[PDB]
């Protein structure tokens, strides 16, 4: 079956700056600003646009050795990012792939909110473990706050 899971998180960074750093250069930043979560980001194919395949390696004492993502869509105008988890990590057994959508929306105070949508493709009637859904939420926020701290400490960056 297909199971959807959504999340919203708040950031002080405005939408235009956050999209450039967190989405367009998240692959560059994540090994640098969050070494405890991402050890290395490795492009397999493409630039980073649609059709791009990337191998994300996790540091030692890892829940998963690696994971492979496919970039599905990058909408600069609407601050919308689509990618799919297709190999490694939780992929296998009863879980076929994970379809993800991230949309950054400007907020009335000058900040932004991230609308994360996680779409899991499971085996027949099987269901996903709540820890799997929880772990993805943990990973996203830690990366966001690490990039958020980087931008605040580097006011010239992405601006």
């Amino acid at each position, epitope marked *: 079956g297909v199971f959807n899971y959504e999340t919203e998180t708040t950031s002080v960074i405005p939408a235009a700056r956050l999209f450039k750093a967190f989405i367009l250069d998240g692959d560059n930043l994540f090994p640098k600003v969050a070494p405890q979560a991402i050890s290395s980001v490795e492009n397999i194919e493409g630039n*980073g646009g649609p059709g791009t395949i990337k191998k994300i390696s996790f540091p030692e004492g890892l829940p998963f050795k690696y994971v492979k993502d496919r970039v599905d869509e990058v909408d600069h105008t609407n601050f919308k990012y689509n990618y799919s988890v297709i190999e490694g990590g939780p992929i296998g057994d009863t879980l076929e792939k994970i379809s993800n959508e991230i949309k950054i929306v400007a907020t009335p105070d000058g900040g932004s909110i991230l609308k994360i949508s996680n779409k899991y493709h499971t085996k027949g009637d099987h269901e996903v473990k709540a820890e799997q859904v929880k772990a993805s939420k943990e990973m996203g926020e830690t990366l966001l706050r690490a990039v958020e701290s980087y931008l605040l400490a580097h006011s010239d960056a992405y601006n």
Partner: antibody
Amino acid sequence: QVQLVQSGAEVKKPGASVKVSCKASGYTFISYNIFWVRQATGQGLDWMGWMNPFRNNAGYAQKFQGRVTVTWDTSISTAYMELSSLSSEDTAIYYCAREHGSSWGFFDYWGQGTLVTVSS
Amino acid sequence: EIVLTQSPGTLSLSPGERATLSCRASQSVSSSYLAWYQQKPGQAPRLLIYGASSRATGIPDRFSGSGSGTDFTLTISRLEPEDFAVYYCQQYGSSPWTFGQGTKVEIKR
């Protein structure tokens, strides 16, 4: 099927500039990088510079020393390379090659070659 | 740069024989990031073994690659008349990316 079709033979006087085109087809143009590689029979292969149509930036080989300029037209999926200040040492065949990935930089598909002859 | 030295400059062999081509790197090439290309006179290079051991699509099984660190090899288990050409090795483990000078596989009589 991915193809890289280049413009044809150029004959130039020394001191002039040559602009070679490389039209890509069979894939999304902005999704892959394209390098330019010279092949003169003197040496083997030398990369000249690379374009990144998704990040809108470029990098250049040191040996050619800023005589290489890479531009592109996404609307027609065509990559351009202009080699300014042409001498008789620049007589060679120039190739355009698609980079497979920004980290897996192996050129899966290659252009057919463009001959540039710069003699007086 | 990582300078790639290929040996021998010319390899002379008969059809059906094993061909072993060497690509020595001045520095260690990370993750076995080295590729092999085939080029015939008047033609563009064609991708072959990549990742130092992985075949490109359309490449027959007689082409195989091996090695790690500073030494990589390209093996043609059984040469055929279509296999006599110049082969190049290309590393992409460290920027900037460099090629070898070329090893020519020659017919022999």
